[PDB]
Design a protein around this ligand. Structure first.
Ligand code: NA
Ligand code: NA
Lengths: 402, 78, 402, 78
């Protein structure tokens, strides 16, 4: 009925280890600052830039990961985690408690234990982007979403056929009303896209991404219209790539119906929609004002011609666009680029744009002061004589094909 | 009706025979507990009396002697 | 042909992380000393005592494990590791590089990665004792022995049916000539005990332990005789428990033939050998001098009578024994205990020893000044009137059976 | 036949047009490289010349500027 003296000493010891943990955690902070300071120091504002440099050089691994530990950083992006082990992910979670947004791209080694460490050790986590977590099975996804119930506001997952319809249901059941941003890209086992309008009810929803459904008819006009009837009001990012089953119906009965004239869209992508016509998009763009559009892509929207692009530029987007992708728009003529005069445009993808020639590149270089890169891959009518005033570089020349 | 107990230092301690009976390793008499300081034994005796009484307040254990006191409790099997 | 400036900076960074690791390793040393000092401090000489206290209280786990990290300790024993995770074992290996001998008892969670961390991160490791590593399969055992080739001088494994004959072969092939100490206890899949005489050729071999073979005929007289012909000269520890197939032949043709008269044996155990006679052991003990015998057990050697014990005591063992186990020796009489007068004996197991009565306990208490514990479980003729001079305690009374 | 280069500080640096051609992001002319100190650009130019020459001794990189220099090499794609 009385605890032994041994047990009592053990309780005292255990209690003091816990308090000593926090002291040791601080001593860890200083040791990690020492590493960063010895290399010349690095503010938190540049940590993501450092991660990008390492990622591009396949140099992000458990060793270099230590550069990012015990900081007050809140939003971290790793562009290539391929070499980070399951223990690397666990250590990051232990030593980065201030994280609210985390993006792990090419995270092939992230496993069950790694995923639950992230959910349970990052109490402020509200946004998770994962590309390639192919180890996680459907039952683990369920456990992760239960743990994140009511906390997860942003979830993007890509490149895994083990994220099943069951896993999508558990995401929506556990986090549906909390989601304001959702991404589903290259998920071969997903077919129940029709459930999205039921569960995505948050009145602040702003980012929807759907790319390359396995069976294209599973992302049809009816589903996207119903979804737009829910989120169109606050939508700032709409990405629908490879959804080849969509038609002008989505444009006429969905976008035009439910996107406000004071359109807050900052990102719009409708790649590979060979059934959308120039007419429907012209009709839609003339109705709304796109004064906040930063990024726009129509890659492989084979039907789109001049008026779609002209209506886009003349209805606000001209002054805000920073990157524009017209790749494979064979129907465009020189008249479309006459109107392409944007003060802030920096990147322009004109790959496989038949009409582009030296005169177009010349005109674009003079009408776009901040344009720095133009992809002309496939534009055979662009020769060496293509004038390139100081600062502009052309990629996709013949030298890149021999 | 007492039992004497000696520390590493020459300081001694007396314990009720009924209290020292709690320790299976104390069948005495007189016992010499080398390798243990005076502050440790004083706390061991404090626990023994504390044990017989309530066998409920908590038995306070100073942090600065938690390890050494654990070893003494183990040897005494208390 | 010229490395990019990015790659060169990455090499410089990576190189300085490695050097900073050692600095961080030292800062870790101070933080672990702080924990120990805050609790009153603990020298390395008491670390094993601390581990024992925690083990007996089921209080050894990943949390309390931190008390044992970053020390200069060389020999560590954990009596109950059940609660230590695979990460706990990995951290121990990382933060205890000075280890040469490690005993992990009840190490159920030790897995493939944990075992290879031990072999690869403890460069001075030469002795490993594992009890209950039931996760390790035969193929992992092989990899571990390859890594330990030429380094492993002492190996004891117990309580796992996944340590197969193949695993034993890989132990002997890779470490045979290096072994001076070997333990095989309760290994249900082991049958090739006949391979031991071939491989255990080290001229300094001193410790052999074999307990409870699955098929008792696999440990026969012929094998033990041949083995004794190899190691008998330097043998300091012989333990053969549950090897019920052994007979006086092992005693006459093995022990007596190959144990030197100046016998260095410090530990001898022959439990459950119901075919060994009083005559053979008397014959053997009168030939040799056992002046160094510290521990001896004849538990459940049902045939053994007075002369075996008398010859043992009168041929040197009397003055050196510290613990003696006569449990279930029903043939003993009071005369055997007349000679049991040992200055250093502290523990005596007389459980189920028919002849023991109050007069024997009385006599033993007076003839053995350092005797502190006597197990009389089953000795019904021991009553409450059993005199117990100051310091002696009797365990196994009737109060423990009602 | 040179190309001027400006640092965050008003200090300037000239580079052989053939050397600056190694950087896909330097098509100039004149370039203003804010957010980078004078010691960093001086080392970037040192690498560019070092590159054109041997394109072999090792290019020394001071430890105290390894991180910031990595970021500059990334932006310059060198
Ligand atoms: Na680590
Ligand atoms: Na840990």
């Amino acid at each position: 009925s009385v605890s032994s003296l041994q047990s009592l000493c053990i309780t005292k010891i255990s209690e003091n280890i816990s308090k000593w943990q926090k002291e040791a955690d601080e001593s860890s902070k200083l040791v990690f600052n020492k590493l960063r300071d010895v290399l010349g120091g690095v503010s938190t504002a540049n940590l993501n830039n450092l991660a990008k440099a390492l990622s591009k050089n396949r140099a992000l691994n458990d060793h270099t990961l230590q550069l990012f530990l015990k900081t007050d950083l809140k939003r971290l992006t790793f562009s290539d985690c391929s070499k980070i082990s399951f223990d690397g992910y666990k250590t990051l979670a232990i030593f980065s408690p201030h994280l609210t947004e985390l993006s792990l791209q090419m995270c092939g080694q992230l496993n069950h234990e790694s995923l639950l460490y992230i959910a349970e050790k990052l109490p402020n986590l509200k946004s998770l982007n994962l590309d390639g977590p192919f180890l996680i099975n459907e039952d683990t996804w369920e456990k992760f979403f239960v743990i994140m119930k009511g906390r997860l506001e942003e979830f993007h997952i890509s490149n895994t056929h083990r994220f099943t319809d069951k896993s999508l249901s558990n995401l929506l059941i556990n986090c549906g009303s909390t989601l304001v941003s959702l991404g589903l890209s290259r998920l071969d086992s997903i077919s129940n896209y029709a459930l999205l309008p039921q569960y995505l009810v948050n009145d602040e929803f702003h980012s929807l991404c759907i790319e390359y459904p396995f069976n294209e008819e599973d992302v049809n006009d009816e589903i996207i219209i119903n979804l737009l009837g829910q989120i169109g009001r606050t939508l700032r990012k709409l990405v629908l790539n490879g959804c080849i089953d969509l038609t002008d119906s989505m444009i006429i009965n969905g976008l035009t119906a439910f996107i406000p004239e004071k359109c807050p869209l900052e990102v719009l992508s409708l790649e590979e929609s060979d059934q959308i016509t120039t007419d429907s998009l012209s009709y839609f763009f003339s109705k709304v004002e796109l004064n906040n559009l930063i990024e726009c892509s129509f890659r492989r929207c084979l039907q789109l011609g001049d008026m779609a692009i002209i209506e886009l530029l003349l209805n606000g987007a001209r002054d805000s666009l920073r990157s524009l992708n017209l790749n494979s728009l064979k129907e465009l003529t020189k008249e479309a680029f006459v109107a392409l005069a944007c003060p802030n445009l920096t990147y322009l993808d004109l790959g496989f744009v038949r009409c582009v020639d030296d005169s177009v590149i010349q005109m674009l270089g003079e009408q776009n002061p901040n344009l720095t890169v133009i992809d002309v891959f496939g534009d055979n009518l662009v020769t060496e004589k293509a004038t390139m005033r100081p600062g502009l570089t052309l990629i996709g020349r013949q030298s890149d094909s021999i | 009706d007492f039992v004497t107990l000696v520390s590493k230092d020459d300081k001694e301690y007396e314990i009720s025979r009924s209290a020292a009976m709690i320790s299976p390793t104390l069948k005495a008499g007189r016992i010499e507990l080398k390798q243990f300081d005076s502050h440790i034994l004083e706390k061991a005796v404090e626990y023994l009396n504390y044990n017989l009484k309530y066998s409920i307040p908590e038995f306070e254990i100073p942090t600065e002697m938690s390890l050494e006191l654990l070893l003494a409790a183990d040897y005494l099997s208390i």
